[PDB]
Amino acid sequence: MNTVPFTSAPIEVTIGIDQYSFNVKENQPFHGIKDIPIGHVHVIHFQHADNSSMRYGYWFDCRMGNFYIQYDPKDGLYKMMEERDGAKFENIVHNFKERQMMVSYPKIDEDDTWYNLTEFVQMDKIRKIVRKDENQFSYVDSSMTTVQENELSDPAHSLNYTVINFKSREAIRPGHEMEDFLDKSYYLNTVMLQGIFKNSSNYFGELQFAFLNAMFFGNYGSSLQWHAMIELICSSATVPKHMLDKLDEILYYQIKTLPEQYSDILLNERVWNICLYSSFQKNSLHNTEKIMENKYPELL
Amino acid sequence: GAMNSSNYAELFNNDIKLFVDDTNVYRVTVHKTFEGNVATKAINGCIFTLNPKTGHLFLKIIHTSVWAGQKRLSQLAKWKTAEEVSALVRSLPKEEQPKQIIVTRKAMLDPLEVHMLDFPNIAIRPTELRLPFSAAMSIDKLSDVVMKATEPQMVLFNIYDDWLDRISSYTAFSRLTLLLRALKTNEESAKMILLSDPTITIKSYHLWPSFTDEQWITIESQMRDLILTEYGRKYNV
Numbered sequence: 001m002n003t004v005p006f007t008s009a010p011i012e013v014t015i016g017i018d019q020y021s022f023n024v025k026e027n028q029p030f031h032g033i034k035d036i037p038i039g040h041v042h043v044i045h046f047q048h049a050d051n052s053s054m055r056y057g058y059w060f061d062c063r064m065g066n067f068y069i070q071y072d073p074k075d076g077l078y079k080m081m082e083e084r085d086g087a088k089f090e091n092i093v094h095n096f097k098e099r100q101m102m103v104s105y106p107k108i109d110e111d112d113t114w115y116n117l118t119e120f121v122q123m124d125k126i127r128k129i130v131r132k133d134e135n136q137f138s139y140v141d142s143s144m145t146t147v148q149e150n151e152l153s154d155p156a157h158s159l160n161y162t163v164i165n166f167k168s169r170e171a172i173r174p175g176h177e178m179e180d181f182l183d184k185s186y187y188l189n190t191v192m193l194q195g196i197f198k199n200s201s202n203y204f205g206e207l208q209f210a211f212l213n214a215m216f217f218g219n220y221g222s223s224l225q226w227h228a229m230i231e232l233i234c235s236s237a238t239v240p241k242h243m244l245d246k247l248d249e250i251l252y253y254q255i256k257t258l259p260e261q262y263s264d265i266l267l268n269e270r271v272w273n274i275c276l277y278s279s280f281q282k283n284s285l286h287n288t289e290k291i292m293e294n295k296y297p298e299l300l
Numbered sequence: 301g302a303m304n305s306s307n308y309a310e311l312f313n314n315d316i317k318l319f320v321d322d323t324n325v326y327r328v329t330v331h332k333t334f335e336g337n338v339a340t341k342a343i344n345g346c347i348f349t350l351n352p353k354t355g356h357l358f359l360k361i362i363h364t365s366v367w368a369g370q371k372r373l374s375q376l377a378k379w380k381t382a383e384e385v386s387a388l389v390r391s392l393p394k395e396e397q398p399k400q401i402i403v404t405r406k407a408m409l410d411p412l413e414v415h416m417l418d419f420p421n422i423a424i425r426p427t428e429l430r431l432p433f434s435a436a437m438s439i440d441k442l443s444d445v446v447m448k449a450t451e452p453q454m455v456l457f458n459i460y461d462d463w464l465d466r467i468s469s470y471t472a473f474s475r476l477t478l479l480l481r482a483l484k485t486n487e488e489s490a491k492m493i494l495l496s497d498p499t500i501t502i503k504s505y506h507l508w509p510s511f512t513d514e515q516w517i518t519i520e521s522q523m524r525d526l527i528l529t530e531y532g533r534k535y536n537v
């Protein structure tokens with residue numbers, strides 16, 4: 001079990017840790033989060049009480065270093081930092097635990113939700129999408145645009161998701177125009193899987209990361225990326241059986257976790273109706289179709 | 301964006317553009333089988349690709365052999381149309397290639413866009429106009445060359461004959477669309493109007509009769525009457 005201590009909490013803020021969240025009052029004696037499961041990436045995120053504008057946060061993996069949070073009054077946000085002095089860090093954490101000034105990561109034993117949402121997500125791939133090589137953790141916020149959004153402006157602050165574009169020369173073989181547009185298997189299997197992602201685990205990792213940034217930060221370009229990666233699979237007649245089975249599980253847990261009240265903005269009617277009812281894979285996503293129909297029948 | 305009443309004069313500026321109409325590409329007769337089921341028999345078709353400024357019509361004849369062994373022919377027809385338009389563009393010298401292609405049906409947008417990815421600077425546009433180019437096969441000489449074709453063939457016609465010697469391309473297009481609208485609403489009546497007087501002939505190298513300026517005014521008035529009429533005979537007014 002690992003710990004992310006806080007120097008202090010000078011401004012009133014709602015703090016998220018993965019799918020959990022709690023409110024901290026202005027100058028409340030809060031000194032961090034303990035008992036964080038090792039073996040998974042995590043995200044610690046923030047919404048100030050006075051400016052619900054800009055949700056922001058940090059992806060991290062406690063195996064990669066000792067990280068803490070400290071409010072910066074100049075830049076006006078809670079910043080993640082790495083502590084390189086291991087003994088200073090352990091002494092800080094032990095003091096804060098003794099004084100019981102930390103919240104406990106509140107995982108139910110039965111509960112595999114976070115695993116199921118992050119199964120293929122790896123910190124090393126996160127750090128290639130979010131480029132800031134001097135830190136071991138990655139900042140994301142509501143306003144960051146994607147490389148593809150920038151093509152249609154600050155590149156250092158961009159989400160470098162893999163560009164997917166169904167009407168592109170990358171996606172369409174000369175002479176197979178109709179074939180490749182109507183059946184995207186070539187683009188999925190040769191261009192993206194064999195060529196760019198190398199395997200389906202990396203593809204699923206990026207899909208999962210895009211969903212999580214859409215859900216936790218309302219990041220619009222991340223939602224576009226998530227739906228594009230779903231649509232590319234669903235619009236392919238030829239998909240490995242193991243990928244379809246895994247995709248069904250992935251989407252099931254994403255739809256299960258989505259706040260009911262955010263479905264109007266986070267779910268694209270066209271993609272979902274196409275994927276569940278028109279596409280080649282309309283009959284291949286049984287778990288996802290069943291939860292979508294019972295939880296969001298309006299969308300459909 | 302989309303082409304409508306607001307931006308109508310743009311058709312006659314000096315940026316090369318082509319209309320593409322695919323309504324006559326896949327054509328069938330529907331008939332009964334010996335068992336009393338229904339079946340289709342394809343007949344020859346054509347892509348109608350027209351420069352509205354010059355009158356230049358690139359009539360790509362679609363021979364029924366192109367459909368042999370193929371499924372979902374109405375879908376294929378849109379992609380075949382886009383393949384042939386793309387081939388036409390690539391065949392033209394750079395300075396003759398269009399800067400815009402306007403499709404008369406929105407279902408042609410994605411097929412043509414995908415086929416023209418190599419030409420990012422050619423704009424593919426829909427239109428809100430209800431243009432009567434489906435009536436092209438009511439023009440006797442065009443119907444004749446399509447139905448006689450025994451293989452794929454491109455034929456060139458000036459759809460304005462020599463009218464641009466005497467009128468502008470705005471006025472020529474307006475006459476063309478009036479004639480075609482008439483032929484679409486009541487083909488028999490329209491053709492009666494055009495050929496009633498045996499002394500006005502169609503030149504061998506023309507599609508329409510050799511009307512004087514005065515006779516065109518009479519003709520155009522008779523076509524307007526027809527279109528309003530049928531619009532009464534239809535709606536009872």
Ligand SMILES: Cn1cnnc1SCC(=O)c1ccccc1
Pocket residue numbers: 355356357358456457458
């Ligand atoms: C010159 N030519 C060749 N064939 N018919 C013609 S007469 C109309 C014309 O110039 C034209 C040119 C190109 C395409 C369509 C029409």
